């Protein structure tokens, strides 16, 4: 009516405004820099002990301890240098689909089909890990969660909303609305001033932690978005979706920069992460293996095969030493 | 070698044996996924259980003839069914509830849901236990109103049992994989133990078939 026309003309104006900034392209600018060699990586460790599909993992900030969550109702904290199990937390609900590890190292988090984000305290005087909080208030499954400052946490659910919580009081400090489909992942900015969310409406949004407002909206994908990750610079990000393609967007240019797709890949993408310098892009697929792309050339530089089922989680340490990949065959592998 | 890393390794091994024991104890459980459309007789099925805080998934434990059954109710999700269904890829069976007394074409919605679930790419090799609830109201309505309204191609009489069999076979022939999986059908009755005995028999049959596939036969 009188407002759909307004929305359509605003959208057309936005498209024209972001069309005038495309003087060049990242590909034709990077056309004259040396390509990276064939990236060949070795499996240093294999972490066994999970008895079901591993759905999430997260590295410690010291890049030695990592947390993994499986569908058998278990959290395991591994010391990756020696493959020792530091802690094994039994969860009340076996249906866990995400996990996070606090930047300080004192707490971990879980969530899933029970719509509750559970916060567990690792450093207790009693000598055992006990649940510290149960944040409830979402009306859909938790799909991701990221600790912010050891006392507040950002979560995303299948009720098409994200939230920022306060662990002491247990109540939603902020609620982020504006998506249309399920929100499947989020990524915090390095300075924790902004974050990005990718939803099943084939769109990504850039939220400001303060003021609870959506800065920019990015489109270009064809299907549901399953993964997202900020560039180390903090001025760009990458998204993986179900159309077997990755996209690199830039915040300042407010438009798509590059796409990473191949004719031999038809399966969707489950996870995405960057390298320490941002030159490499790691992506996990449903065809049972991971792909290492050149972030500036958009051509595969390596393949990480060795998993017998879909690769579901993927992470890179804070110093860039190793890459941990976990799949649905209940194994995690450290690559270097 | 190791100074007090040996104590860390010993703690890791104790954690390993506890994990293995928990896995063994959890592998002796029967897990069933309970599905339906719009509370169409789910309550009268769960009422045979004998053992707002959590609104995402509902657990149900019971025990029959020393066998422990776990039932999962996911009717309060309201999300995209394709985003979380693969979590239940390994359940022993899917208990699907259909209300026979149907009026705003709800039978078509039930048939659509059954068609989607049965031919799903994750639930290959997973059996389905169909529960046709509310047969007395079906008796009454078929006495008053024929079945032709819901299904225009009904070329039979208004007799209760032949129309019920028609509905049963018209549900059962939606199974595209007539050889990979089997469908067990039941008409829920007021008797308390009949439903549980039917579920026990179906689970026994599906366990026997799974062991046939695992133990090298077939």
């Amino acid at each position: 009516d009188q407002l759909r026309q307004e929305a359509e003309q605003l959208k057309n104006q936005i498209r024209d405004a972001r069309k005038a900034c495309a003087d060049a392209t990242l590909s034709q600018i990077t056309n004259n820099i040396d390509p990276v060699g064939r990236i060949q990586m070795r499996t240093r460790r294999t972490l066994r002990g999970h008895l079901a599909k591993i759905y999430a993992m997260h590295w410690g900030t010291d890049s030695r301890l990592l947390v993994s969550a499986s569908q058998d109702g278990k959290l395991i904290i591994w010391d990756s240098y020696t493959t020792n199990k530091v802690h094994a937390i039994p969860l009340r609900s076996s249906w866990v689909m995400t996990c996070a590890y606090a930047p300080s190292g004192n707490y971990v988090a879980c969530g899933g089909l029970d719509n509750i984000c559970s916060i567990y305290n690792l450093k207790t005087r009693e000598g055992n890990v006990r649940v510290s909080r149960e944040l409830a208030g979402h009306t859909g499954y938790l799909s991701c969660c990221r600790f912010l400052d050891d006392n507040q946490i950002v979560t995303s659910s299948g009720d098409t909303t994200c939230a920022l919580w306060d662990i002491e009081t247990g109540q939603q400090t902020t609620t982020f609305t504006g998506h249309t489909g399920d929100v499947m992942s989020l990524s915090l900015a390095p300075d924790t001033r902004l974050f990005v969310s990718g939803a099943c409406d084939a769109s990504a949004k850039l939220w400001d932690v303060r003021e609870g407002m959506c800065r920019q909206t990015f489109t270009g994908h064809e299907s549901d978005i399953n993964a997202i990750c900020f560039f180390p610079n903090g001025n760009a990000f990458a998204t993986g979706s179900d159309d077997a393609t990755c996209r690199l967007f830039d915040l300042r240019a407010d438009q798509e920069l590059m796409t990473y797709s191949h004719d031999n890949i038809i399966c969707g993408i489950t996870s995405v992460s960057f390298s320490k310098s941002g030159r490499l892009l790691l992506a996990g697929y449903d065809d049972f293996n991971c792909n290492v792309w050149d972030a500036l050339k958009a051509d595969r530089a390596g393949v990480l095969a060795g998993h017998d089922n879909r690769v579901s989680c993927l992470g890179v340490t804070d110093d860039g030493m190793a890459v941990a990949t976990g799949s649905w065959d209940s194994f995690l592998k450290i690559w270097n | 070698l190791s100074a007090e890393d040996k104590a860390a390794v010993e703690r890791s091994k104790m954690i390993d044996r506890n994990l293995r024991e928990d896995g063994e104890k959890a592998a002796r459980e029967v897990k069933l996924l309970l599905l339906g459309a719009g509370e169409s007789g789910k309550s009268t099925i769960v009422k045979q259980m004998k053992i707002v805080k959590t609104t995402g998934i509902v657990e149900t434990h019971f025990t029959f003839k020393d066998l422990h059954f776990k039932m999962f109710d996911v009717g309060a999700q309201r999300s995209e069914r394709k985003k979380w269904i693969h979590c239940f890829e390994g359940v022993t069976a899917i208990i699907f509830c259909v209300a026979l007394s149907d009026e705003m074409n709800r039978m078509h919605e039930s048939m659509k849901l059954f068609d989607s679930i049965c031919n799903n790419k994750w639930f290959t090799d997973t059996s389905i236990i169909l529960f046709l609830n509310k047969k007395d109201l079906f008796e009454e309505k078929i006495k008053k109103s024929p079945l032709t309204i819901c299904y225009p191609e009904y070329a039979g009489s208004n007799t209760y049992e032949e129309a019920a069999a028609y509905i049963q076979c018209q549900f059962e022939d939606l199974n595209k994989r007539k050889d990979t999986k089997e469908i067990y059908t039941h008409f829920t009755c007021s008797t308390d133990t009949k439903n549980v005995q039917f579920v026990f028999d179906a689970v026994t049959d599906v366990i026997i078939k799974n062991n046939l596939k695992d133990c090298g036969l077939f």
Partner: single-chain antibody, 232 residues
Framework: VQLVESGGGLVQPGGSRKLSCSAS????????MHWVRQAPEKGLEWVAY????????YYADTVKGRFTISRDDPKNTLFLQMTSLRSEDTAMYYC??????????????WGQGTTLTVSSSDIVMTQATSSVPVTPGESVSISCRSS???????????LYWFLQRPGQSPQLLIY???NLASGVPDRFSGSGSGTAFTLTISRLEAEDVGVYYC?????????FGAGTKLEL
């Protein structure tokens, strides 16, 4: 969390006793347990260790054969059954918990100790200084020295600093030569290299006096060395 000891008293030589240590307020099954001994007006001396799950058991050379450590986890109790009691076993016995994983702090909690009286170690660590006169406005340095390089091939130096106040049980100050234990004021600090280590107190108070001990956790005999006394 508390450890409570019982079973002390006067015993004739050659007899036998059983000391009990009841633990309340923590997961007793997850902690390894140590029995430590302090002779009257002498330094600490490790006696026995039992692992979690009763897997590994270690005894001191001077008490091996006539002592037996055990635990009963359902009742949360730790027993030391000692036999052939000599006149050198008169002391106070402390019960110490210690949990080992990556980044843990063993020896953090000590029991009160029970007194037992009897009527008529390839690494040696030396604390050369025996007493130091101080005022509650300065900084104090306590030096410890080892006969072996406590630094291990994995980058960890296994030195622990304990403090015993007059009339109390020792408490963990520093673990692995650099890390402050939980609930310890920031004024304490530790450093060193391989064979020579130092504890530093920036600004003392009235509660910083007592006897300081430096234990090793590299080879399992776990020698202690006579402490350094701070008074006035």
């Amino acid at each position: 969390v508390q450890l409570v000891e019982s079973g002390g008293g006067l015993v004739q030589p050659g007899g036998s006793r059983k000391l009990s240590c009841s633990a309340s307020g923590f997961a007793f099954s997850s902690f390894g347990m140590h029995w430590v001994r302090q002779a009257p007006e002498k330094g600490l001396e490790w006696v026995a260790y039992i692992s979690s799950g009763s897997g590994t058991i270690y005894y001191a050379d001077t008490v091996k054969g006539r002592f037996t450590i055990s635990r009963d986890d359902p009742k949360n109790t730790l027993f030391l059954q000692m036999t052939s009691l000599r006149s050198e076993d008169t002391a106070m016995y402390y019960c110490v918990r210690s949990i080992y994983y990556y980044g843990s702090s063993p020896f953090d909690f000590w029991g009160q100790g029970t007194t037992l009286t009897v009527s008529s170690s390839d690494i040696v660590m030396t604390q050369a200084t025996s007493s130091v006169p101080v005022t509650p406005g300065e900084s104090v340095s306590i030096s410890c020295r080892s006969s072996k390089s406590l630094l291990h091939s994995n980058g960890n130096t296994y030195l622990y600093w304990f403090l015993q106040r007059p009339g109390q049980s020792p408490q963990l100050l520093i673990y692995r030569m650099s890390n402050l234990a939980s609930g310890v004021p920031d004024r304490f600090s530790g450093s060193g290299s391989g064979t020579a280590f130092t504890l530093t107190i920036s600004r003392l108070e009235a509660e910083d006096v007592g006897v300081y001990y430096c234990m090793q956790h590299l080879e399992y005999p776990l020698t202690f060395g006579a402490g350094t006394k701070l008074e006035l």
